[PDB]
Design a binder for this molecule. Structure first.
Ligand SMILES: CCCCCCC/C=C/CCCCCCCC(=O)OC[C@H](COP(=O)(O)OCCN)OC(=O)CCCCCCCCCCCCCCC
Ligand SMILES: CCCCCCC/C=C/CCCCCCCC(=O)OC[C@H](COP(=O)(O)OCCN)OC(=O)CCCCCCCCCCCCCCC
Ligand SMILES: CCCCCCC/C=C/CCCCCCCC(=O)OC[C@H](COP(=O)(O)OCCN)OC(=O)CCCCCCCCCCCCCCC
Ligand SMILES: CCCCCCC/C=C\CCCCCCCC(=O)OC[C@H](COP(=O)(O)OCCN)OC(=O)CCCCCCCCCCCCCCC
Ligand SMILES: CCCCCCC/C=C\CCCCCCCC(=O)OC[C@H](COP(=O)(O)OCCN)OC(=O)CCCCCCCCCCCCCCC
Ligand SMILES: CCCCCCC/C=C\CCCCCCCC(=O)OC[C@H](COP(=O)(O)OCCN)OC(=O)CCCCCCCCCCCCCCC
Ligand SMILES: CCCCCCC/C=C\CCCCCCCC(=O)OC[C@H](COP(=O)(O)OCCN)OC(=O)CCCCCCCCCCCCCCC
Ligand SMILES: CCCCCCC/C=C\CCCCCCCC(=O)OC[C@H](COP(=O)(O)OCCN)OC(=O)CCCCCCCCCCCCCCC
Ligand SMILES: CCCCCCC/C=C\CCCCCCCC(=O)OC[C@H](COP(=O)(O)OCCN)OC(=O)CCCCCCCCCCCCCCC
Ligand SMILES: CCCCCCC/C=C\CCCCCCCC(=O)OC[C@H](COP(=O)(O)OCCN)OC(=O)CCCCCCCCCCCCCCC
Ligand SMILES: CCCCCCC/C=C\CCCCCCCC(=O)OC[C@H](COP(=O)(O)OCCN)OC(=O)CCCCCCCCCCCCCCC
Ligand SMILES: CCCCCCC/C=C\CCCCCCCC(=O)OC[C@H](COP(=O)(O)OCCN)OC(=O)CCCCCCCCCCCCCCC
Ligand SMILES: CCCCCCC/C=C\CCCCCCCC(=O)OC[C@H](COP(=O)(O)OCCN)OC(=O)CCCCCCCCCCCCCCC
Ligand SMILES: [Cu+2]
Ligand SMILES: [Cu+2]
Ligand SMILES: [Cu+2]
Ligand SMILES: [Cu+2]
Ligand SMILES: [Cu+2]
Lengths: 239, 241, 382, 96, 153, 77
């Protein structure tokens, strides 16, 4: 008779992102000045290019392992899922959504405007600035991994989402992912199209457009609520 | 059954309410913040970009986007009238966090030079109009008019002390202008700022009201379009491939 | 920082910064440093860079470690963007005030609209002290002296916190009840009208009226507190006075200019005609912030950044007094690690292999003539 | 993949045409000399939309950046033209 | 002036053009100034007669790498070889599927719900091999071209 | 009419009209009036006004109460 909501998992989901991104901010503060200013220097290499390579390799490994583990341990027979266990799985999926929202805030909101700050205070020299390394290649893949994991868990554990591919969930999960390829346009926007460090330039409208797809969350939320209510919780609550 | 009693169902519903509020709030923070900054953030970053023509015109038009969709979802499905307020609060929270911890905590730009614009009154007007009228067309028209018109009067108490004239080295300057001059933005030269410079067709002290009315009209249009955009975004559809 | 990654030919063919001085190398907090010099606009302006019709004199540094107290182009203060003419030389002066301690690489730059950044030579300056001692006093036309570091900070905090609290209260008034699932079920069941009561309507009306009234009263109070306000001052300042410089009594034609691609040097054949000004001798070749000097003819005493100063990087086949009238063809060799360090050897990736630079000629009395050279640069691979 | 493989696939063909030449004192490409010698009366030199270098152009990243931008826009255009073709495949009959 | 140039209004310029005869016949030759945002500005035309055979025309060019080439036929065979190779690969890919019924039986099977029977494991292996071979061949060809011509601008 | 509402600095920094003459103050119908003078273009031309590469000499009046018989800039129609 385990509790319906696992408080330890929710606390871990918040705390791991909080601590990791606080350490990332500390690293940016410590080494963003001594080594990050000049891109053709050895300290810049050993303090940011190594970071980029390590983060890319770790992101690939983590995404592969997590997605493969979630897809391998799927519930083959969901017809025997008891309503209480279905409610517990719904709470776990809600914890996954909480983690995805926290990662989305950390990526799209915090580090994007930090990148804006960095570009307004220095002269851009390379596409692999420390700000670009942290924002485009660390936070965006992290929230992409979290969203893919949440979608896979919902599809493989919740009977509500197991009957097909949820269009609002697919838009909410893949839409922000398209922000990562669009970075190329951003680079093509800064190197060829726009000669000025203007944050409202059209070369950034790609980001904006895919950010709009995050609004799909509302539709997803509705489905989630029905997944919470179809198991008998709604009937008891309406009384 | 999933729950064993009505009280347990109520407690579970309250927990779901808190968690879903967290999810909605922070997903809105991320998406609305990225859209808002990449649409109008140059005027929002610096106090010497807060002019009477471009800032007043542009900011409400591009910022009325998310509140329209979130209202169209929340009021229709839950009768929750706080969509615009929650969007504005999330955007303000993200902006202030970045200003304090990155603009000032990292690059040491003074807070009085890098502060966001106030947006709560417009969201409150929109939300109250939607709640009291109950119709999206009247809400669109009147609430968007109010949202466009109240933007500059709401921010005037903040930027008014920054417009005291100064004789700086023989030239007339504003306090915000001196702030922009002294604190060097290496990646942001002076010619980039989209501020009013005066036109031969500019008339007798009508810049700010004209900008406000134009912003209100375009806010009506953008609210009308983004209401249906959010209605599409709220679809509960399932695909088989 | 940011120049090494810029195309070599773009750096060679835009703006040339010649004799520069820094008043101090180490400054304390609140102390001022003056950077003066001359900049020449190259006649063969690249086509992908817009003409400097709208240009801004800027200071390149990792942030507001200094504050730019003032900037003058031709003796005229330039707080706004200015208009520069192709082929003219201008004096520039920048007075900065130290704000943050540490070692800072400071560069003088010209931001050009439709072109991008044009960074000049960077110098390392040390600031000693504490940032808490920095003050920025400004006296207004209303008779008030304020400190720009903390001016209007409390008012902004108060108003933003007030409006955020109002929004939070508006949300929390509705947040005391069940939020998502029961309300969704009631709306689906057709009981939406039961979710809003008359008290809720009165609360919404009060919120709207209070918001409008508070905004109006706050605007009136702000107007009363500050009855004298002006709009933001902006515009492009034309009519910058250029330098009226002695035309070079020295004529230089570039026969050939080549660089070995592996390579840390550049070689050029030059025909030089002296049109008076006594026997002259080449003492320096300036390319892209890099100065190659002939120690026997000239020595820098201005503290030119050493990473960009090659004291004996100019090798002239015959650097003997060029008697007025003598037309000598000489082979000059500009060699220095800066060629590779500042990535000037990356002209091999450029879609335009043409260079431009400045030659400095000195007579027996020490008078200096500046000659401007431009040619195509041919890589050597054999 | 379609966006990224375009330039590597064509490099074996155009690589011999990029050997530098000292043509009449100016550095030229073999393709550049081909365009110079064989006169296109209706196609002057200023029309060619080719890279000329920008002050924001960085250290040897032109081709990869162009390839990645092309790949992203190819994603977008493929997504739109899939539905365009789906409409074009309709078996509808009109009565007027 | 192998590139576009900038001219000033109201100024006079000398111009010289050296041309080499390539094809026989009588040709009306004009000197012209193409102006961007303006169009063609044609000058006086003169009739010039070229006598000989086009097969005798040569266009020798000496590169900075020490190689002398003829621009009439330089790199022609390489282009033909690569285009023919890729066209043959595409034709083979189409013809692998073209050995079976193409349009009507496959359409009926898809309509009947038997689409999964139209692709076998061998077809999947062939597609995987085609993709891997294409990528590997592109990479190897790029490496070989870089090795053959290490100096490019 | 229409100048009082134009920005003061724009009026100060564009064109200066110096010595001007009007041939007549009161005219009959079909009679002609000549307005001559000099105009100087200010060197510090405002940036929001395009350079006078395309400029037209016009007569400001509430309509065709007059007809502009001719106009000369530097002696050229
Ligand atoms: C479990 C916690 C609750 C969940 C929410 C997360 C809240 C956590 C806040 C962490 C506070 C400590 C920050 C100090 C770092 C402490 C820290 O890392 O200090 C070192 C760096 C400075 O290093 P340096 O650059 O080498 O130094 C030279 C120039 N300073 O400062 C900082 O990083 C401080 C500024 C940035 C701190 C981040 C802001 C706090 C994050 C808030 C997240 C938003 C949550 C919303 C909730 C409403
Ligand atoms: C945010 C941008 C919105 C994208 C457009 C909306 C999606 C397309 C709708 C119409 C066609 C599909 C059917 C209804 C949708 C939902 C959907 O795709 O359902 C699966 C259907 C198959 O289902 P069915 O039962 O056979 O009948 C059709 C369902 N109405 O797939 C399709 O019809 C084709 C594939 C769907 C389109 C791809 C996924 C779209 C998600 C965004 C992609 C990423 C782009 C953004 C990145 C920045
Ligand atoms: C390639 C461009 C696509 C054009 C748009 C698609 C055609 C229009 C569709 C909606 C209205 C018609 C009904 C469905 C279509 C097919 C169609 O036109 O059917 C006949 C119907 C009448 O049929 P019905 O049984 O009464 O019910 C409607 C059928 N869905 O006509 C109409 O409804 C009006 C005339 C149709 C439109 C003109 C022909 C379009 C062909 C292209 C014209 C040339 C332009 C391109 C030249 C470069
Ligand atoms: C010490 C702090 C608290 C405890 C730590 C555990 C988490 C906190 C709370 C919930 C569990 C508490 C008790 C658990 C005891 C034991 C424990 O560690 O349980 C958690 C999982 C087991 O997951 P489960 O079988 O679903 O069952 C969980 C319900 N108790 O442990 C594991 O070993 C992980 C499971 C296998 C999946 C691994 C994921 C792939 C890893 C590779 C990297 C992925 C990518 C990285 C990022 C890029
Ligand atoms: C689907 C996404 C489309 C974009 C919609 C979101 C807003 C994004 C960008 C534009 C916002 C304005 C700020 C500039 C940032 C976008 C940006 O970077 O704009 C640069 C220009 C100034 O530089 P520039 O050298 O002129 O460059 C032109 C590139 N747009 O700003 C401008 O605003 C001026 C450009 C002309 C556009 C005027 C604004 C639109 C006026 C209203 C008509 C449009 C319809 C409104 C609805 C009724
Ligand atoms: C509507 C309910 C009645 C309440 C009053 C309404 C608003 C106030 C006054 C109405 C009288 C009109 C004259 C304004 C005072 C007129 C007024 O106060 O004008 C101030 C300045 C002029 O400054 P100045 O020259 O130094 O002053 C001398 C003027 N000879 O103009 C402006 O601010 C321009 C007006 C603002 C732009 C809006 C124009 C309206 C466009 C129509 C669409 C908007 C209407 C919505 C339709 C539903
Ligand atoms: C149009 C609908 C009628 C109701 C609104 C009244 C219409 C007139 C003005 C309001 C637009 C904003 C102010 C700028 C005007 C245009 C206007 O009058 O601008 C002049 C100054 C700005 O000048 P500046 O050069 O920046 O110097 C600062 C001096 N204040 O603003 C004002 O004088 C403010 C005028 C009114 C302020 C109160 C706003 C409240 C009304 C708007 C909200 C309506 C929503 C209704 C809810 C249903
Ligand atoms: C700036 C101008 C205002 C913005 C425009 C939107 C305002 C309102 C309405 C106009 C278009 C949306 C109405 C919804 C379509 C209309 C709509 O709501 O659904 C049409 C169907 C629904 O999918 P279905 O069930 O599979 O199809 C069978 C019919 N139910 O979409 C489709 O079939 C696919 C196309 C849908 C594309 C709509 C996406 C909405 C746009 C998101 C982009 C961001 C906003 C851009 C504007 C800036
Ligand atoms: C940052 C500062 C925070 C400000 C906090 C403001 C407080 C907000 C809301 C209070 C909610 C109380 C609702 C009581 C209804 C609770 C309620 O509905 O009670 C039944 C009454 C019965 O009243 P009655 O006497 O029979 O009839 C009216 C005449 N006698 O109905 C009502 O209609 C009562 C309406 C009362 C509504 C009060 C809300 C006004 C709030 C404005 C706040 C101003 C902002 C601050 C100014 C600086
Ligand atoms: C993905 C599976 C793992 C395999 C490796 C992936 C690709 C290779 C390396 C990864 C490390 C990153 C650093 C690159 C080597 C870095 C590298 O080789 O850069 C070469 C040149 C730089 O030339 P240079 O200055 O003379 O050299 C000195 C540099 N200090 O840059 C480039 O070519 C620019 C990079 C290409 C543009 C793409 C940027 C990425 C944008 C994000 C969207 C695309 C990603 C898709 C998302 C799914
Ligand atoms: C992004 C997804 C990961 C897989 C692809 C690897 C990403 C990196 C580069 C590939 C883009 C094309 C090359 C230009 C880059 C960008 C890049 O590296 O450009 C430099 C040169 C071009 O320089 P130049 O000035 O024109 O001089 C010629 C010198 N070669 O290209 C290269 O060095 C080529 C790099 C890699 C070539 C192999 C391409 C194979 C990979 C692409 C296909 C992937 C499809 C996967 C199928 C599922
Ligand atoms: C560059 C951006 C990507 C291209 C855009 C297309 C990508 C995918 C979806 C977007 C629009 C097409 C979806 C089909 C409509 C959506 C569609 O498939 O059919 C809508 C109905 C079908 O006709 P019906 O049976 O009579 O109506 C009853 C509903 N079945 O069309 C209509 O009623 C008429 C309008 C249809 C017009 C669609 C033409 C497609 C465009 C061809 C132009 C060329 C492409 C331009 C883009 C460059
Ligand atoms: C212009 C030059 C033209 C190049 C022509 C290339 C030939 C193309 C296709 C051959 C089709 C044979 C299919 C046999 C399956 C015919 C087939 O499916 O046979 C059953 C086998 C059984 O094999 P098994 O041993 O039981 O299991 C595998 C390990 N033993 O299944 C298979 O899966 C066999 C897979 C074989 C597929 C071979 C295709 C590879 C073609 C690559 C061509 C490379 C391009 C040229 C390089 C220069
Ligand atoms: Cu960008
Ligand atoms: Cu530097
Ligand atoms: Cu020069
Ligand atoms: Cu008049
Ligand atoms: Cu004048």
């Amino acid at each position: 008779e385990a509790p319906l909501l696992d408080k330890k998992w929710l606390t871990f989901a918040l705390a791991i992102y909080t601590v990791f991104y606080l350490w990332v901010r500390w690293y940016e503060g410590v080494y963003g000045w001594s080594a990050g200013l000049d891109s053709f220097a050895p300290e810049f290499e050993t303090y940011w290019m190594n970071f980029l390579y390590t983060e890319i390799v770790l992101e690939i490994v983590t995404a592969s392992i997590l997605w493969g583990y979630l897809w391998k341990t799927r519930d083959r027979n969901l017809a025997a899922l008891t309503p209480r266990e279905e409610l517990r799985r719904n709470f776990t999926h809600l914890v996954w959504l909480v983690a995805y929202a926290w990662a989305i805030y950390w990526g799209a909101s915090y580090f994007t405007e930090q990148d804006g700050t960095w570009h307004q205070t220095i002269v851009r020299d390379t596409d692999f600035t420390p700000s670009h390394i942290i924002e485009f290649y660390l936070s965006y893949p992290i929230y992409i991994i979290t969203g893919f994991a949440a979608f896979i868990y919902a599809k493989t554990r919740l009977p509500f989402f197991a009957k097909g591919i949820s269009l609002p969930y697919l838009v909410l999960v893949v839409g922000p992912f398209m922000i990562l390829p669009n970075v190329g346009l951003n680079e093509w926007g800064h190197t060829f199209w726009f000669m000025e460090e203007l944050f409202v330039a059209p070369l950034h409208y790609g980001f904006v457009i895919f950010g709009w797809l995050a609004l799909a969350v509302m539709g997803t939320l509705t489905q989630t609520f029905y997944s919470f209510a179809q198991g008998g919780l709604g009937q008891s609550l309406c009384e | 059954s999933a729950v064993r009693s009505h009280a347990e169902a109520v407690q579970v519903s309250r927990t779901i309410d808190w968690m879903a509020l967290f999810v909605v709030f922070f997903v809105i923070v991320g998406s609305y913040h990225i859209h808002a900054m990449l649409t109008m953030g140059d005027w929002d970053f610096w106090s010497d970009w807060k002019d009477r023509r471009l800032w007043v015109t542009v900011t409400p038009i591009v910022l009325v986007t998310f509140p329209a969709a979130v209202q169209s979802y929340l009021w229709e499905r839950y009768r929750l009238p706080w969509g615009a307020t929650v969007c504005v609060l999330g955007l303000l929270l993200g902006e202030w966090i970045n200003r304090y911890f990155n603009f000032w905590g990292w690059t040491y730009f003074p807070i009085n030079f890098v502060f966001p614009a106030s947006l709560v009154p417009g969201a409150i007007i929109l939300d109250t109009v939607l709640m009291l009228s109950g119709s999206y067309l009247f809400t669109a028209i009147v609430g968007a008019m109010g949202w466009g018109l109240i933007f500059y009067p709401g921010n005037w108490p903040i930027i008014a002390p920054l417009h005291v004239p100064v004789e700086y080295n023989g030239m007339l300057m504003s306090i915000a202008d001196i702030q922009g001059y002294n604190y060097v933005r290496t990646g942001t030269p002076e010619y980039i700022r989209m501020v009013e410079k005066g036109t031969l067709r500019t008339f007798g002290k009508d810049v700010a009201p004209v900008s406000a009315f134009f912003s209100a009209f375009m806010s009506i249009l953008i609210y009308f379009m983004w209401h249906f955009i959010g209605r599409w975004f709220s679809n509960e559809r399932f695909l088989q491939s | 920082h940011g120049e090494k990654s810029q195309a070599a030919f773009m750096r060679m063919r835009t703006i040339h910064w010649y004799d520069l001085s820094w008043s101090k190398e180490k400054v304390k907090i609140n102390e001022t440093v003056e950077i003066k010099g001359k900049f020449h606009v190259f006649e063969g302006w690249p086509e992908t860079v817009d003409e400097p019709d709208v240009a801004f004199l800027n200071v390149g540094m990792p942030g507001p470690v200094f504050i730019r107290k003032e900037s003058y182009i031709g003796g005229q203060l330039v707080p706004r963007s200015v208009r520069l003419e192709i082929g003219k030389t201008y004096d520039f002066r920048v007075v900065l005030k130290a704000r943050r301690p540490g070692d800072w690489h400071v560069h003088t730059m010209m931001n050009v609209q439709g072109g991008g950044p044009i960074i000049g030579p960077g110098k390392w300056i040390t600031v000693e002290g504490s940032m808490s001692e920095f003050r920025n006093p400004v006296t207004t036309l209303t008779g008030q002296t304020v400190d720009l570091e903390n001016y209007n900070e409390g008012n902004t905090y108060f108003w933003h916190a007030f409006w955020f609290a109002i929004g939070v209260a508006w949300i929390g008034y509705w947040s005391r009840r069940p939020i998502f699932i029961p309300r969704l079920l009631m709306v689906d069941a057709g009981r939406a009208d039961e979710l809003v009561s008359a008290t809720d309507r009165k609360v919404a009306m009060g919120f709207l009226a209070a918001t409008i009234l508070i905004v109006v009263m706050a605007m009136s109070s702000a107007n009363s507190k500050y009855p004298i306000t002006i709009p933001l001052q902006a515009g492009t300042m034309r009519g910058m006075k250029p330098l009226e410089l002695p035309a070079p009594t020295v004529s230089v034609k570039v026969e050939d200019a080549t660089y070995r691609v592996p390579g840390r040097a550049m070689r050029m054949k030059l025909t030089i005609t002296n049109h008076g000004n006594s026997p002259i001798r080449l003492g320096e070749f300036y390319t892209a912030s890099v100065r190659f000097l002939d120690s026997d003819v000239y020595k820098d005493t201005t503290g030119y950044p050493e990473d960009l100063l090659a004291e004996d990087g100019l090798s002239v086949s015959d650097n003997s007094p060029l008697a007025p009238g003598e037309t000598r063809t000489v082979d000059v060799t500009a060699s220095d690690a800066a060629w590779e360090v500042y990535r000037l050897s990356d002209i091999i990736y450029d879609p335009d292999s043409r260079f431009a630079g400045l030659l400095f000629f000195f007579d027996a009395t020490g008078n200096r003539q500046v000659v401007q050279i431009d040619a195509p640069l041919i890589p050597s691979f054999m």
